[PDB]
Each structure stands twice: as structure tokens, then as C-alpha cells.
Amino acid sequence: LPVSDADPFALDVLQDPLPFQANLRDAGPVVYLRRYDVFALGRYEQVHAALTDWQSFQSAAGVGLSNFRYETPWRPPSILLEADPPHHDAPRAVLSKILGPRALQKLRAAWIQDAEALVDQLLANTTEFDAVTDLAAAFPLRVFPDAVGIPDAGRENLLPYGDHAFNAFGPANGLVEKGAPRVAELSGWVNAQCARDALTGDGFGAQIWAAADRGDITYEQAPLVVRSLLTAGVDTTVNGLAAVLYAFATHPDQWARLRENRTLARTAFDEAVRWESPVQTFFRTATRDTEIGGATIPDGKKILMFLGAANRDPRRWENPEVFDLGRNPSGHVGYGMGIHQCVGQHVARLESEALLTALASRVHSLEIAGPVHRHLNNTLRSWESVPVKVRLP
Ligand code: HEM
Ligand SMILES: COc1ccc(C(=O)O)cc1OC
Numbered sequence: 587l588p589v590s591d592a593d594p595f596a597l598d599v600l601q602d603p604l605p606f607q608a609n610l611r612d613a614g615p616v617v618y619l620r621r622y623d624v625f626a627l628g629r630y631e632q633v634h635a636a637l638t639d640w641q642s643f644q645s646a647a648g649v650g651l652s653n654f655r656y657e658t659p660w661r662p663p664s665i666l667l668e669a670d671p672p673h674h675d676a677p678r679a680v681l682s683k684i685l686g687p688r689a690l691q692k693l694r695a696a697w698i699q700d701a702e703a704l705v706d707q708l709l710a711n712t713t714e715f716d717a718v719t720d721l722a723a724a725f726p727l728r729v730f731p732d733a734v735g736i737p738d739a740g741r742e743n744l745l746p747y748g749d750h751a752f753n754a755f756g757p758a759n760g761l762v763e764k765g766a767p768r769v770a771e772l773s774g775w776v777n778a779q780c781a782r783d784a785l786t787g788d789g790f791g792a793q794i795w796a797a798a799d800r801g802d803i804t805y806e807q808a809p810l811v812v813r814s815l816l817t818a819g820v821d822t823t824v825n826g827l828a829a830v831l832y833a834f835a836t837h838p839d840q841w842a843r844l845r846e847n848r849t850l851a852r853t854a855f856d857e858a859v860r861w862e863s864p865v866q867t868f869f870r871t872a873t874r875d876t877e878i879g880g881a882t883i884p885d886g887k888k889i890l891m892f893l894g895a896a897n898r899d900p901r902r903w904e905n906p907e908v909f910d911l912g913r914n915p916s917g918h919v920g921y922g923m924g925i926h927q928c929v930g931q932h933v934a935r936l937e938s939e940a941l942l943t944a945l946a947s948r949v950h951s952l953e954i955a956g957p958v959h960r961h962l963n964n965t966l967r968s969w970e971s972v973p974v975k976v977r978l979p
Contacts, residue, residue, distance in 0.1 A: 587881050589618045594626070594867065594890065595756045600962050603866065604907075607895035615879025622651060622757070624869065624888040625881065628895035630902035630919070632879045636870060636891050638924030642878075643870035643889060645926060646670045650755030650869055650965075653888065660754050661773060664817070665810045667926065674925065677811050680797045681929045684790055690932050694940075697729050701940035704728070705948055709978065714955055717835065717972040722828035725941050730819050730933070734812070735789025736779045747772040748821025749963060755869070756964020776816050780809035790815060815930075821966060822864060823934050828969035830858035830938060833909045835952050835974050843911045844946045850911045851946060855938030859920035861909045863894035864967050868922065893919045894967075951977035 590613065592606060593599060599606045610617060610628035617626040627633050636643050646669055648654040654663065663669070665677050683689065708720055715721075723745070731741055750769060753762040765772070778784060785791035791812045798808040834841045844850050869890050872883040883889055896919045898906040903913075921928030928934070956973030 587616065587618050588613045589620050591620050592617075593621050594619070594892075595759065595964050597962060600964070601960065603894060604898075607892060607898055610892060610895050611899055611901075616881035616883075618881075619890065622888075622890070624651070624890045625883050626890045626892065627879065628892040628899070629879075630896040630899035633891045633893065633896035633919055634917075634923055636878065636889055637919060637922050637926075639876075640670060640925055642873060642876040644670050644873050645870060646673075647871040648869065651757055651888070651890075652754075653871065655871075655886075660750075660769075662810070664814055665807060666814050666929070667818075671925070676803050677807055677814075678925070678929065680794060680803050680811060681814065684793045684797070685929055685933055687932050690936055693729075693733060694936060697936055697940040698943055700729055701725060701944035702947075705941075705944040709948055709976070713978065714973070714975045717831040717974045718824075718828045718969045719971070721941065721945075722831055722969065722972075723824045725827065726820055726823040726937055729937065729940075730823065733789055733933075734815050734819070735785040735787045735791045736816070737784070737786075740775050740779075743772050743775045744816065744820040745824065747776055748817055749961070749966070749968065751817050752821065752865075752966035752968075753964050755867070759964075761962055761964055776813060777809070779816060780812040782808065785812070818930060819933070821968070822930070823937055825966055825968045826855070826859060826862075826864045826934060827938060827941060828972060829862035829864055829967065830855055830942070831974070832958065832969070832972050833858050833861060835954050835972065837909050838951070838953070840909055840911050841952055844942065845950070848943070848946060851942040852935070852939050853915075854911055854942055855935055856918065856920075857909065857911060857913050857915045858938075860897040860903075860913075860915045860918035862967060863897045863920045865920065865922075865965060866894045866967060867892055867965055891919075893922070948978065949976045950979045 607628060610626060615629055615632045619626050627636055704725055727741060750764055782795045794811045795808050797803055798805050867890055869888045872885050872887050874885045876883045900906055921931045953975050955975035958972050959970035961968040961970045
């Protein structure tokens with residue numbers, strides 16, 4: 587069994603993980619990370635299988651490094667993400683309906699128009715702007731919390747909260763050790779927003795509570811289902827949108843493709859999720875000795891799954907380093923796979939579609955105009971700044 591002291595959460599890896607991915611995949615199906623006493627999987631075949639194999643590889647002992655058999659979680663674990671069947675079943679079914687294609691039909695017009703308003707306002711203002719601040723971050727922060735049905739006061743808390751959540755999956759470091767003085771402030775505010783009386787419209791929050799009335803989940807599950815939406819909903823989409831915008835800005839070939847064929851706007855996002863894999867890593871815990879990739883993972887030990895590495899595995903993907911709108915990216919693992927596969931994927935897709943729709947209409951050319959700054963995070967490839975300059979037709 588290959589053994590290595592490679593550190594996936596060293597700052598150099600986090601800055602640029604591609605060498606690490608290649609080393610990982612090359613070495614074998616399974617690499618023992620001596621530093622963390624976890625078993626790493628980087629190839630598409632094993633990552634895909636580990637993800638779907640909930641029976642052998644559970645989520646309730648944590649999907650971060652921390653082992654909940656022994657270690658105190660930083661917050662009450664997600665009753666979706668950090669739950670196994672049968673406990674997972676009813677909260678999952680509630681969100682899978684509420685966030686599913688048919689349910690979002692009612693929001694498509696509105697999100698597309700909102701994006702048009704945002705893009706037209708921005709371009710009226712300037713042809714030189716930050717793609718992160720002015721687009722990737724602006725847009726989800728309009729439409730998503732609205733659709734959930736939370737108030738406008740405090741929305742600035744969503745990103746630091748999500749950032750903390752993603753950091754928490756990794757080891758203790760000045761990334762993860764981000765607050766304490768403010769973490770409790772953030773947790774106090776998110777939880778408050780989950781209460782039935784905090785929520786408005788017949789938005790997603792109210793629909794969770796209605797499902798509870800029908801007995802699909804309990805009233806004590808309801809706020810925690812809402813909470814899932816407020817932890818996973820905003821930070822993933824901002825950073826995913828920052829990534830697709832970065833990819834276009836540095837791939838003028840693929841921008842020209844989108845312009846030519848408007849329909850690639852609906853599926854550009856998924857190639858960007860494969861290519862970038864915003865969510866890089868998740869852990870599982872072995873429920874028993876499992877023989878995967880020639881290796882036996884001892885019962886009780888953790889696997890670390892490298893979604894990025896799998897999404898760039900040449901065993902599965904032709905020229906995987908290429909950002910290619912002509913790829914069929916179906917079967918990518920950027921949203922995971924199996925029973926825990928991103929229940930929010932349709933929302934993220936619609937957000938991307940709306941924003942790309944509106945931008946491709948108005949923007950001939952797009953270039954990097956300044957240094958880009960990544961925000962380092964243990965789990966989520968995240969973005970501080972992507973300065974761009976556009977040319978209008
Ligand atoms: C509004 C947007 C989103 C929402 C509301 C959302 C919500 C969720 C939720 C609640 C889960 C847990 C489901 C379960 O355990 O059954 C999940 C899983 C996941 N999401 Fe998302 N998500 C969103 C966008 C994204 C994006 C853009 C990505 C990646 C770029 C992403 C990556 C994932 C991954 C990798 C998992 C799998 C967790 C696992 O296998 O343990 N999500 N999402
Ligand atoms: C994909 O990542 C997540 C999924 C669900 C949750 C959740 O709070 O349900 C949180 C996540 O990251 C912080």
C-alpha cells in the first residue's frame with residue numbers, strides 16, 4: 587500500500603493542487619497519508635465507488651477529518667450531510683423535492699431577469715470590475731436568500747459562515763482558526779433565520795415547514811433542514827460562479843463558443859464544476875474492513891476522496907486539464923455521487939445559466955485585468971478577487 591507524507595492541506599497544495607492530484611492518481615488507487623492516518627482516493631473509479639457506497643463508507647461520524655465517534659463537532663452536525671440511512675432519508679426527500687427541476691421552473695424567469703438587471707447595471711457603470719465581488723458574489727446574494735425567504739439584515743454573515751463550515755472539515759490551522767469571537771455571532775444569526783417565524787413568502791424555508799406539517803419531517807428537523815440551505819447554498823455558488831467566470835476570462839476560446847451558441851450557457855457550469863471542482867475533498871468513515879483498490883481500509887478508519895483529482899483523471903476524461911464546452915461532463919463527481927449527491931445542484935445550475943445568459947448577451951470579450959487572489963480554504967476552492975476587463979459589441 588503506498589505510504590506518503592504528502593499534505594493535502596499544506597498551503598502550497600491548497601494554492602495549486604494539480605501536482606498533488608497527479609502524484610496521487612499515479613501512485614495507485616489508494617494512498618496512505620501517514621500524516622493523517624487516512625486513505626486517499628484520487629482516481630475517478632474509486633472516488634465514484636466510495637461516494638456511492640454509503641453502507642461501507644458512512645457519513646455520520648463526520649465527512650471532515652474530525653471523527654465524531656470521539657470528537658466534539660463544532661456545531662450540531664448536518665442532518666443531511668452528516669447522516670446515514672435511515673435518518674438521512676426524510677430530510678433528503680424533503681429538499682430533493684423543493685430544490686428539484688419542476689420546483690425551480692417558477693423561478694427561472696425571475697432569476698434570468700435579475701441577472702440581466704445586474705449585468706446591465708454593471709456594464710453601464712464600468713467595463714473594468716471584480717468578477718468575484720461584482721458578479722459571482724453579488725448575484726447569489728440577491729436571489730438565493732430571497733428564494734429561501736430570510737430577511738435582508740445580516741446577509742453579510744452567510745459567506746463567513748459557509749467559509750468556516752468548509753474549513754472545519756480540514757485540520758486545525760489559521761484557516762480553520764478563523765474566529766471564535768465571531769463564530770458564535772454567525773451561528774446565533776443563522777439559527778435565528780431558520781425559525782418558522784423568521785421566514786417569508788412561500789420560499790424554500792416555508793416549504794420545508796409545510797413538509798413538516800404534512801409529517802414528512804418533524805418540527806425539530808425543519809430549522810436544521812433550513813440550516814443546510816444557509817450553510818451549503820451561498821458559499822458554494824459564489825465560488826463556483828467565480829470559477830466559471832475565471833475560466834472564461836482565461837479561456838477566450840470557450841467564451842467565443844458560448845457567444846456563438848447560447849445553449850452552452852445551460853451546461854457550461856457543470857464543465858466548470860468538473861474542471862475546477864469547487865468542493866475538493868470529502869471524508870467517509872469505514873463501517874467495516876473494506877477492500878477497495880487492492881487496499882483494505884480498516885473498520886473505523888477514514889477515506890479522503892479527491893473530487894478534483896477524479897474529475898481530472900485521464901482514465902475517465904479525454905484531455906481532462908482542458909476547459910471544454912464541447913465535453914459531455916455528465917458523471918463528474920463535483921457534486922458527489924449517490925444518495926448524498928448535491929441536492930442543490932439544480933439551483934446552482936439555474937444561477938449559473940441566468941448569469942451566463944445575461945453576460946454572453948452583452949459581452950464580446952473578457953480578459954484578466956489584474957492579479958487574481960484565491961481565498962485559501964481546506965475544502966472549498968474559494969476566491970477573493972478576479973479583476974476583469976470586458977469589451978462590449
Ligand atoms: C445553492 C447551491 C447549493 C445548495 C443549496 C447545496 C446543498 C447541498 C446539500 C444540502 C448537500 C447535502 C445533501 C445530502 O447529504 O444528502 C449537498 C451535497 C453536496 N454539494 Fe451541494 N449545494 C449547492 C451547490 C453546490 C455546488 C456549486 C457544489 C460544488 C461545486 C456543491 C457540492 C456538493 C457536494 C460535493 C456534495 C456532496 C457531499 C457528500 O457526498 O458527502 N454544492 N449540497
Ligand atoms: C457540500 O457541503 C455541504 C453540504 C451540506 C451542508 C449542510 O450544512 O447541510 C454543509 C456543507 O458544507 C459546509
